[PDB]
């Protein structure tokens, strides 16, 4: 089955609009940024706001948010289902509901 979190190229505002209607904290999606070619962003619902994280890439081609690195978006997402996306707030990724 394809992943329910890959939304492709959707504007940041649309992502917020959609995530705001979600009922659970941690509801998220990965989108292709309009800020730069071939870049990804992670948008997550938390409380009454939507937080955005820029998916960084290093020289070897690994993805990362802070320090830990991943060989794919799939691994990054799966990791953050059990480990908080932030050290300051407890945010665990969970699939959106349709």
């Amino acid at each position: 089955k394809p992943h329910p979190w890959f939304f492709g190229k959707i504007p940041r505002a649309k992502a917020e609009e959609m995530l705001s209607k979600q009922r659970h904290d941690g509801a998220f999606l990965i989108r292709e940024s309009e800020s730069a070619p071939g870049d990804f962003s992670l948008s997550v619902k938390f409380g009454n706001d939507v937080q955005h994280f820029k998916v960084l890439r290093d020289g070897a081609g690994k993805y990362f948010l802070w320090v830990v690195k991943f060989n794919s978006l799939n691994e990054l997402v799966d990791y953050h289902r059990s480990t908080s996306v932030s050290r300051n707030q407890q945010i665990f990724l969970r699939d959106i509901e349709q």
Binding site: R12, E34, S35, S41, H52, F53, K54, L56, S86
Partner: peptide
Amino acid sequence: XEYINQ
């Protein structure tokens, strides 16, 4: 657009 990790 603000990013938490930036």
